[PDB]
Amino acid sequence: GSHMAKTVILDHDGNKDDFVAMILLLSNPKKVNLIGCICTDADCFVENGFDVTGKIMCAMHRLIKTPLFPIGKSTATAVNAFPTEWRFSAKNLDDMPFLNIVEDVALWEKLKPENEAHNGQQLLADLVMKSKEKVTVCVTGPLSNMAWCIEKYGEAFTSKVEECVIMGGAVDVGGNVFLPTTDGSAEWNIYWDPPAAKKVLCCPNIRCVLFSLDATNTVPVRSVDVKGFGAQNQYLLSQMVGTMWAMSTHEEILRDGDAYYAWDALTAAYILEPTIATLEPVALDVDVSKGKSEGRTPRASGKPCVHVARNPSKQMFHDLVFASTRVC
Amino acid sequence: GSHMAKTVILDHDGNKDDFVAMILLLSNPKKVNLIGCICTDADCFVENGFDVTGKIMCAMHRLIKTPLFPIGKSTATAVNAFPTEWRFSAKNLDDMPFLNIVEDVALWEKLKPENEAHNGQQLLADLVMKSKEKVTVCVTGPLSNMAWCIEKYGEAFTSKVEECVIMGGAVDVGGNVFLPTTDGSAEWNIYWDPPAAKKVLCCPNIRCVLFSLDATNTVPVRSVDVKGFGAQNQYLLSQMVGTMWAMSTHEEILRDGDAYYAWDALTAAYILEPTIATLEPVALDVDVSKGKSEGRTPRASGKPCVHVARNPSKQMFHDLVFASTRVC
Numbered sequence: 001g002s003h004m005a006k007t008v009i010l011d012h013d014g015n016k017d018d019f020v021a022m023i024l025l026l027s028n029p030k031k032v033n034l035i036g037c038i039c040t041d042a043d044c045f046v047e048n049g050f051d052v053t054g055k056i057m058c059a060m061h062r063l064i065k066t067p068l069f070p071i072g073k074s075t076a077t078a079v080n081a082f083p084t085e086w087r088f089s090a091k092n093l094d095d096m097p098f099l100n101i102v103e104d105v106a107l108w109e110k111l112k113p114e115n116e117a118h119n120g121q122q123l124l125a126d127l128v129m130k131s132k133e134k135v136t137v138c139v140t141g142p143l144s145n146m147a148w149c150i151e152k153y154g155e156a157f158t159s160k161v162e163e164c165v166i167m168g169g170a171v172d173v174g175g176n177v178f179l180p181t182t183d184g185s186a187e188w189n190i191y192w193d194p195p196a197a198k199k200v201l202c203c204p205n206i207r208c209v210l211f212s213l214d215a216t217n218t219v220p221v222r223s224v225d226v227k228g229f230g231a232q233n234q235y236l237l238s239q240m241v242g243t244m245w246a247m248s249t250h251e252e253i254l255r256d257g258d259a260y261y262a263w264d265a266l267t268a269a270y271i272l273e274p275t276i277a278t279l280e281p282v283a284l285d286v287d288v289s290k291g292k293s294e295g296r297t298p299r300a301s302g303k304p305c306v307h308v309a310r311n312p313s314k315q316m317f318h319d320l321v322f323a324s325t326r327v328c
Numbered sequence: 329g330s331h332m333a334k335t336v337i338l339d340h341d342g343n344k345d346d347f348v349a350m351i352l353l354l355s356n357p358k359k360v361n362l363i364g365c366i367c368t369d370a371d372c373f374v375e376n377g378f379d380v381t382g383k384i385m386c387a388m389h390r391l392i393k394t395p396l397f398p399i400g401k402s403t404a405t406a407v408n409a410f411p412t413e414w415r416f417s418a419k420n421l422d423d424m425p426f427l428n429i430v431e432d433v434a435l436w437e438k439l440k441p442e443n444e445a446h447n448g449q450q451l452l453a454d455l456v457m458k459s460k461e462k463v464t465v466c467v468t469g470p471l472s473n474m475a476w477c478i479e480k481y482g483e484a485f486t487s488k489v490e491e492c493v494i495m496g497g498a499v500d501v502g503g504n505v506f507l508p509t510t511d512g513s514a515e516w517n518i519y520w521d522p523p524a525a526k527k528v529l530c531c532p533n534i535r536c537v538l539f540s541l542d543a544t545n546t547v548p549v550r551s552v553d554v555k556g557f558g559a560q561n562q563y564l565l566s567q568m569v570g571t572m573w574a575m576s577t578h579e580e581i582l583r584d585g586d587a588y589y590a591w592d593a594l595t596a597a598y599i600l601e602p603t604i605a606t607l608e609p610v611a612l613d614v615d616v617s618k619g620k621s622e623g624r625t626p627r628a629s630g631k632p633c634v635h636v637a638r639n640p641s642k643q644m645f646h647d648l649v650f651a652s653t654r655v656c
């Protein structure tokens with residue numbers, strides 16, 4: 001009652017924080033048996049995110065013998081697209097020396113054609129439904145794949161979900177989608193596909209834990225913390241996460257306080273440490289209009305939709321990330 | 329006639345290629361005795377450029393016992409600043425795990441106060457005038473510091489320069505300065521301070537070797553090459569340079585063919601291997617006007633100003649970069 005790992009699927013969209021989330025889950029096999037990953041063409045170009053997922057999988061398998069697992073490119077399409085500039089980060093990671101260790105590249109090239117054949121939405125449905133135990137789905141991209149599963153299979157899928165831990169939305173704080181067509185009240189993961197997020201977030205048959213901006217604002221990614229990885233540069237996982245975070249520490253300056261946060265990574269951290277945040281049940285009325293408020297997740301004007309994460313512990317997050325990135 | 333290392337100062341502005349340049353020079357003590365570095369607040373924020381210069385110097389000193397050396401922040405200011413977004417690269421590098429190894433960070437905090445007192449321009453003049461050998465000055469940022477020295481000390485300075493190997497200009501090809509007020513004909517290093525450039529490039533008392541876009545267009549930083557560093561991830565210098573390049577391989581897509589190149593690195597490569605390119609003597613009419621063609625370096629309607637690098641060897645560049653990055 002403590003020695004059995006949770007079965008987990010990571011449903012991501014391939015930016016730096018998604019892969020830090022992936023590394024936190026995969027680096028902790030005592031707690032997490034990662035049985036598959038989905039990548040969506042949202043905050044990455046899916047082929048890049050796909051390759052990076054495969055090569056992280058292969059490196060961890062090489063170093064600490066975590067299992068290999070199916071990886072599937074979702075064919076979900078945007079309602080509203082991410083800024084193209086942000087979506088290149090998976091290509092940069094694909095080219096990094098830590099993701100081009102020769103043994104890792106060889107194994108991934110052997111495994112790629114089989115994973116190529118998967119459709120990511122069907123894979124999420126198949127992995128959950130074929131799992132012996134209930135599965136925790138960690139969603140760090142849009143909710144498009146979860147919605148597709150719910151629509152297609154209803155309770156035959158949702159009854160096999162333990163919980164869905166989700167990075168998305170903004171409840172009692174401002175959004176982070178700043179465009180001439182928007183009011184700034186929406187968060188990006190929701191904005192990408194609002195109807196998907198409405199279908200999932202208020203589906204009565206799943207437990208949704210929601211790491212909204214309310215909580216993710218507590219963990220800015222800053223230089224003074226990032227420099228910490230230097231002391232443990234001999235570990236591949238510190239090189240990876242250290243580099244991933246270092247690639248982002250200027251964004252707060254460049255965008256005038258609109259920081260890069262460890263959004264996805266904190267979300268995944270909850271799976272690893274359930275006491276890192278307290279939960280608050282909330283009813284949500286997800287805005288699916290095509291006005292300026294598109295994508296907003298305001299409290300409904302009302303039975304709870306989601307358990308909203310509150311007051312996350314910066315210190316626990318820090319200790320998990322640094323301990324995890326010393327694993328190998 | 330080959331066993332005596334050249335005496336070199338790197339006069340740079342702190343971007344990823346400036347540092348790959350610094351690395352090619354410092355990793356090859358048999359060929360190059362690096363006696364100083366100047367950093368200008370142009371394609372970086374100077375405090376970041378300064379720190380990264382120091383920590384690279386400290387890392388190489390620890391690993392292969394290359395000498396320490398003075399480093400100074402120039403007080404040169406922009407006529408036309410680099411795009412702000414580009415300038416943050418040295419902040420990202422400052423935060424990288426390979427540039428935060430405890431021993432190197434500790435040595436650099438010990439040396440920083442003494443280097444902080446230096447004035448970049450004054451340091452450049454002092455080092456050249458006090459050298460026993462004539463000094464090859466590698467310039468990979470704007471020409472502001474060379475122009476200051478030539479102006480203040482005349483022959484006192486210029487007679488102590490072997491040659492100035494400069495990244496700048498575009499002679500028979502287009503520029504890379506793409507702004508609402510410019511015609512695309514000028515190159516960034518010249519455009520940052522055109523009068524300084526005009527003062528050095530046609531200075532009758534200095535040999536200038538110019539790596540303009542004509543040559544540098546041969547060495548785009550491309551994923552298929554960058555992925556090679558993975559095979560060398562055990563060497564610190566391949567982690568640095570592989571990461572520096574992998575941070576930039578997306579730019580060719582992002583700016584629709586306007587690629588990231590190994591501009592400054594090829595410039596330094598010439599100092600290491602003079603047969604990497606051939607030289608053509610060319611008189612230049614550097615444009616200092618405030619219109620569309622500000623910063624252009626056209627052929628003049630004259631005695632040679634510079635010796636322009638031509639048809640650089642892509643293969644020799646590759647072999648030198650990959651050999652140098654296995655040094656430690």
Ligand SMILES: Nc1ncnc2c([C@@H]3N[C@H](CO)[C@@H](O)[C@H]3O)c[nH]c12
Nearest residue numbers: 015017043086140167188189263264
């Ligand atoms: N500036 C930025 N650069 C790259 N990615 C992102 C995101 C992505 N969307 C979620 C948080 O809004 C989280 O899943 C991020 O991966 C938001 N802002 C970003």
Ligand SMILES: Nc1ncnc2c([C@@H]3N[C@H](CO)[C@@H](O)[C@H]3O)c[nH]c12
Nearest residue numbers: 343345371414468495516517591592
């Ligand atoms: N896109 C870009 N990102 C970052 N830096 C640069 C430069 C800098 N200017 C010179 C080439 O024009 C070279 O010395 C570079 O360091 C040009 N384009 C850049």
Ligand SMILES: [Ca+2]
Nearest residue numbers: 013018140141
């Ligand atoms: Ca994400």
Ligand SMILES: [Ca+2]
Nearest residue numbers: 341346468469
């Ligand atoms: Ca430069």
Ligand code: NI
Nearest residue numbers: 001002003004
């Ligand atoms: Ni147990």
Ligand code: NI
Nearest residue numbers: 070114115118
């Ligand atoms: Ni399969």
Ligand code: NI
Nearest residue numbers: 228318319322
């Ligand atoms: Ni710590």
Ligand code: NI
Nearest residue numbers: 253254255256
């Ligand atoms: Ni600003």
Ligand code: NI
Nearest residue numbers: 329330331332
């Ligand atoms: Ni000799």
Ligand code: NI
Nearest residue numbers: 398442443446
């Ligand atoms: Ni001094």
Ligand code: NI
Nearest residue numbers: 581582583584
């Ligand atoms: Ni384009």
